[PDB]
Design a protein around this nucleic acid. Structure first.
Ligand SMILES: Nc1ncnc2c1ncn2[C@H]1C[C@H](O)[C@@H](COP(=O)(O)OP(=O)(O)OP(=O)(O)O)O1
Ligand SMILES: [Mg+2]
Ligand SMILES: [Mg+2]
Ligand SMILES: [Mn+2]
Ligand SMILES: [Mn+2]
Ligand SMILES: [Mn+2]
Ligand SMILES: [Mn+2]
Length: 756
DNA sequence: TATGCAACTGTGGCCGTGGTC
DNA sequence: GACCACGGCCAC
């Protein structure tokens, strides 16, 4: 299989490198013949003689057109002949593309900003990660000597651990008497030993957890201090640390550096993304955490270094196990998109949409539209109407069915052929007309995007059918993550239409999808209520909760299935309402905030404070206990006792101050805020000390006893001292606990006074 | 800023916070 | 006290 591609330059000429693993052997294929190019549409074919003469310069070098070729293509499905302009080196294209666009005989130019090594995959029809080849994988981790107030990596790496199918080991330069610990003389020999291990094992994949942003950079600084050629690359190169906007990423040439952290952070919703928390969530088994401050004391004192080495060994071990489970999911994405796992595992959904479209366009002989210029961008800043959200019938409900459209917006796109190559296209026999916004879509031929979505949705549904019939709970969870990844990808084709930077931008298509969605969901609601005597309790965009008031569970379930048969026969094309579940009880607080309990006692909560990372633990804990008392038991009196226990304890300062921390992310430079909330107030004070606040910095603060603005008396929790600071019990009662639970316990007649 | 030097699919909604009047 | 923009996070 193909692992990756890049290109280097030799004597001015590009050379594509294809990193392969075939029949158990690593290979680099060199392609010295593939040429960069872009396309020009000319006012007349005679003008090619001038265009071929155009020259530019780049750093001393004269840039010329190498050769040209007339080709017949389509643009949004309409046939057109263009000239394919070939050049000697990819960097010729930026240097000359504008001088060609500006030539008076050139109408427009296309496909002039495509990364060369990825262009190569598309045009050659090559897909990374195909085949039955078994890849060799190795995970690693490091333990470091940390002291507060030091520059990054000023202290040495203490241990390097690594794990694979054969087991896990730790390399260190202090004597530790564990069987899996290899002792060497110095930090330098440790690093060199690890380098030797990687070269001997020769893994196809190197697995880290946040190695993109810590492990490799730490190793780099140390290797700069120590004079080490850290030649992990299969071509003898060192890890390449690249900046991609606000964070970094690391390549090891000839291998795939698989950093789990961006994958997990995108797939699993967790309050914290420690390795321990991620391991427990996936496997159900605990992992002890040894903190940076314990690591340093153990090393300086020499006492209890076994515990550090075990912790280091386990980091590698679980990093490996996690990588074993998540690499196959990302490898499927890599094949679906047609790009390397390194890139696919680190990209936003929209970037994957566009790489997929660019490949499908190439296969269909469709020119890509260009990205917008600054003027076109500014023209694309208007919004448009989205999904319909019904105000809920607040309160407790019983015997509730949840019905929900399968992949609604993609299904609309498929059914109504919604696409920029079919919008208001004149001369067709057949059109579908979007409600409210009126855009007309030709139905006589499949639009480009509509014709691609069907295979995605069909693949998702297969994964789902397998997932629901899977006994192993871990394999089922991984199948869930996989079918969810395709759901988000397919919906991102819709969002792409309304995405200002998209090539296949189509705001008319975007708002037609949403308009059809609004029409379908409201039609389904009117139908189930009028023809089946259901009451719709709550509805959001394409699904709703309903019951038959007075009816038992058996009856509600029977009639719901009858409705589905009826309504799915009326719906067109790919549109399908699905039975998503039954809930014996449910509590609806507001739009987007509710909780339901299934017939097995499992509670699911949406939007409520329990699921919010920026509410205090004590508030979330209390609300969770309340909802369990209400929905699982029938004990409203117990729910209130819980609340009073909490307000009493908080008053008596019996609640552990750790449950009172508020976490809120900084999203911009501190100068760009217009209002200063508590987390910005704390962040500005930390900046004044020189701490360095960035977008993505999380402020974890606690509110101290006082009366004025909350940000005036808010401190970071790492500065809290119970011997000096009293937390603001009245604030956590009146501003965290009571608000979250009172919104539920109103429905039973409980005022705030009845709970404190 | 990646031989990918700008910045990461879309809209709807709650609600504490700190302003205004 | 009534009201309102902001901001962060969340549900689709
Ligand atoms: N991440 C998203 N990006 C864009 N649009 C979205 C996103 N999530 C939801 N929507 C839109 C498109 C969805 O089709 C629609 C309804 O959401 P939802 O029911 O969650 O998903 P779905 O109908 O695509 O999948 P499912 O088959 O799991 O119901 O709202
Ligand atoms: Mg690459
Ligand atoms: Mg839905
Ligand atoms: Mn659904
Ligand atoms: Mn749906
Ligand atoms: Mn807040
Ligand atoms: Mn806002």
């Amino acid at each position: 299989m193909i692992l990756d591609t890049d290109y280097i330059t030799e004597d001015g000429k590009p050379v594509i490198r294809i990193f392969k693993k075939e029949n158990g052997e690593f290979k680099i294929e060199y392609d010295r013949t593939f040429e960069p190019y872009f396309y020009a549409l000319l006012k007349d074919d005679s003008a090619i003689e001038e265009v071929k003469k155009i020259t530019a310069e780049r750093h001393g070098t004269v840039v010329t057109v190498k050769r040209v070729e007339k080709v017949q293509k389509k643009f949004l499905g309409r046939p057109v002949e263009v000239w394919k302009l070939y050049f000697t080196h990819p960097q010729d294209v930026p240097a000359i593309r504008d001088k060609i666009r500006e030539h008076p005989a050139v109408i427009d130019i296309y496909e002039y900003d495509i990364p060369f090594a990825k262009r190569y995959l598309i045009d050659k029809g090559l897909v990374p990660m195909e085949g039955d080849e078994e890849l060799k994988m190795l995970a690693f981790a490091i333990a470091t000597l940390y002291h507060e107030g030091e520059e990054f990596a000023e202290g040495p790496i203490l241990m390097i651990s690594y794990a694979d199918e054969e087991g896990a080991r730790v390399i260190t330069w202090k004597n530790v008497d564990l069987p899996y610990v290899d002792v060497v003389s110095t930090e330098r020999e440790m690093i060199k030993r690890f380098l030797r291990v990687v070269k001997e094992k020769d893994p196809d994949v190197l697995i880290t957890y946040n190695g993109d942003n810590f492990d490799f950079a730490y190793l780099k600084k140390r290797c700069e201090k120590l004079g080490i050629n850290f030649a992990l690359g299969r071509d003898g190169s060192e890890p390449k640390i690249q900046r991609m906007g606000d964070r970094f990423a690391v390549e090891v040439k000839g291998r795939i550096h698989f950093d789990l952290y961006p994958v997990i952070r995108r797939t699993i919703n967790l309050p914290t993304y420690t390795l321990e928390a991620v391991y427990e969530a996936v496997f159900g088994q605990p992992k002890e955490k040894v903190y940076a401050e314990e690591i340093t004391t153990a090393w300086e004192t020499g006492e209890n270094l076994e515990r550090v080495a075990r912790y280091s060994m386990e980091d590698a071990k679980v990093t490996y196990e996690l990588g074993k489970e998540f690499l196959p999911m990302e490898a499927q994405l890599s094949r679906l998109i047609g790009q390397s796992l390194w890139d696919v595992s680190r990209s936003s959904t929209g970037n994957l949409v566009e790489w997929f479209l660019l490949r499908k366009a190439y296969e269909r002989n469709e020119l890509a539209p260009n990205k917008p210029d600054e003027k076109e961008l500014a023209r694309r800043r208007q919004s448009y109407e989205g999904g319909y959200v019904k105000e809920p019938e607040r309160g407790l409900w019983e015997n509730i069915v949840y019905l929900d459209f399968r992949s609604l917006y993609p299904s609309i796109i498929i059914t109504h052929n919604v696409s920029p190559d079919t919008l208001n296209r004149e001369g067709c026999k057949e059109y579908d007309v979007a409600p409210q916004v009126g855009h007309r879509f030709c139905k006589d031929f499949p639009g480009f995007i509509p014709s691609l979505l069907g295979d995605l949705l069909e693949e998702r549904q297969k994964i789902k059918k397998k997932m629901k019939a899977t006994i192993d709970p871990i394999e089922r969870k991984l199948l869930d993550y996989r079918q969810r990844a395709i759901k988000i990808l397919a919906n991102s084709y819709y969002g792409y239409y309304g995405y200002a930077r998209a090539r296949w931008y189509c705001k008319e298509c975007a708002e037609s999808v949403t308009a059809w969605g609004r029409e379908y969901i409201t039609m389904t609601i009117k139908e189930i209520e009028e023809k089946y005597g259901f009451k719709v309790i709550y509805s959001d965009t394409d699904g709703f909760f309903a019951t038959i008031p007075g009816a038992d569970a058996e009856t509600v379930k029977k009639k719901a299935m009858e409705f589905l048969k009826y309504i799915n026969a009326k719906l067109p094309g790919a549109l399908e309402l699905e039975y998503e579940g039954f809930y014996k009880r449910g509590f609806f607080v507001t739009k987007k905030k509710y909780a339901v309990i299934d017939e097995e006692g499992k509670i699911t909560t949406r939007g409520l404070e329990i699921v919010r990372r920026d509410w205090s633990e004590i508030a979330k804990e209390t609300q969770a206990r309340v909802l369990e008392a209400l929905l699982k038991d029938g004990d409203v009196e117990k729910a209130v006792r819980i609340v009073k226990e909490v307000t009493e304890k908080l008053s008596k300062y019996e609640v552990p101050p750790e449950k009172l921390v508020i976490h809120e992310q900084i999203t911009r430079d501190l100068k760009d805020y217009k209002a200063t909330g508590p987390h910005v107030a704390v962040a500005k004070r930390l900046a004044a000390r020189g701490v360095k606040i960035r977008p993505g910095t999380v402020i974890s603060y606690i509110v101290l006893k006082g009366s004025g603005r909350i940000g005036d008396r808010a401190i970071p929790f790492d500065e809290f001292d119970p011997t000096k600071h009293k937390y603001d019990a009245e604030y956590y009662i009146e501003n965290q606990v009571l608000p979250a639970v009172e919104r539920i316990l109103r429905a039973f007649g409980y005022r705030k006074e009845d709970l404190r």
